[PDB]
């Protein structure tokens, strides 16, 4: 309901501490073009992105290796292969040396929602995020797939998908048709440089609901936010009212017991401070 003081504050800090960056202009350029639906986008949203900064040097690399894994797939969904494991491991490893993740860590330690040691925290995170779970039994999906891949199932109906890095990847592959941005009547225009937008895209020509997306943010940023919100409540869904920078947000996560489900931001307003 009301603005979550402690979390808008902690998150603002993580935002300030997002060393791994990516910055609007030199690192990526987006083309807003036009409005989705109302009174025309044609080009891709992402006019440019520094591929080398993605292409390792950064935690985007380990991130992209997990995204690509679910692209190829070669495999049934109940099978966790030695390969997917080492990749899960490499990602955790990378994000855990990050100050955002050390910061996130410190918060949850203080609440005894996480343990002091790096490895237990890494295990905790593995289970929340990479342990397979099912809707019956038959664990065919995990938290990273719901949140970042953009859909649970393998196999697809059909997102899900709010991560900017996955949007960029799937857009390049021509599976995402960007339709425009979504504003409000009154309350004016978004900007190429905004770090949260309301965006609409078709998935393989399927028209679907508008959703919000963090833009440029590192994957250890969202990961952190989603983990913390996931641990902050014992119910099926939290919609945590945040105010990051100028944006007023809702940090939503769906929970499935000890495992996390779909998670995303919801944009409430832009020019606020």
From Swiss-Prot:
Gene Ontology cellular-component annotations: nucleus
Protein localization: Nucleus
Alphabetically ordered keywords of this record: Endonuclease, Hydrolase, Lyase, Manganese, Metal-binding, Nuclease, Nucleus, RNA-binding
Boundaries of every EndoU domain copy: 3-269
Main localization, broad class: nucleus
InterPro entries per record: ENDOU, EndoU-like, EndoU_C
GO biological process terms, semicolon-separated: sno(s)RNA processing
Co-factor binding details: In vitro, optimal manganese concentration is in the range of 5-10 mM.
EC number(s) from the headed UniProt entry: 4.6.1.-
Effect upon mutating residue 146 to A: Loss of catalytic activity and affinity for RNA substrate
Outcome recorded upon mutating residue 78 to Q: No change in affinity for RNA substrate
One family name in Pfam for this protein: XendoU
Effect recorded for residue 220 to Q: Shows higher affinity for RNA substrate
Active-site annotation: 146, 162, 208
One GO MF term: manganese ion binding
Cofactor: Mn(2+)
Function noted in UniProt: Poly(U)-specific endoribonuclease involved in the processing of intron-encoded box C/D snoRNAs, such as U16 and U86. Releases products that have 2',3'-cyclic phosphate termini at the 3'-end.
Family: Belongs to the ENDOU family.
Protein name per the record: Poly(U)-specific endoribonuclease-A
Species the sequence originates in: Xenopus laevis
Gene symbol of the encoding locus: endou-a
